[PDB]
Design a binder for this molecule. Structure first.
Ligand code: SF4
Ligand code: SF4
Length: 77
């Protein structure tokens, strides 16, 4: 499962939408948030993101693992 981080935050980007097999990218407001728990781990959204920042949750540095929790949380409750 891959998740967004910091470099994605470019005021309502929307490239990662529609292409995802199960469209598990969501607006909080600022960006499109991937649900790691719905993401079936696939080489689309990251390749589409013109920054290369949608990394595996474990790959995302601890500082930014906060986002993995947020991305989890958003849709869990
Ligand atoms: S394409 Fe990248 S920058 Fe844009 S919303 Fe998605 S993850 Fe963030
Ligand atoms: S990695 Fe694939 S399944 Fe996962 S959020 Fe991205 S496009 Fe959707």
């Amino acid at each position: 499962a891959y998740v967004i981080t910091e470099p994605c935050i470019g005021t309502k980007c929307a490239s990662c939408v529609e292409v995802c097999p199960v469209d598990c990218i969501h607006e909080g407001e600022d960006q499109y948030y991937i649900d790691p728990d719905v993401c079936i781990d696939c080489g689309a959204c990251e390749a589409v993101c013109p920054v290369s920042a949608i990394y595996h949750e474990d790959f995302v540095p601890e500082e930014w693992k906060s986002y993995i929790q947020k991305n989890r949380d958003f849709f869990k409750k």
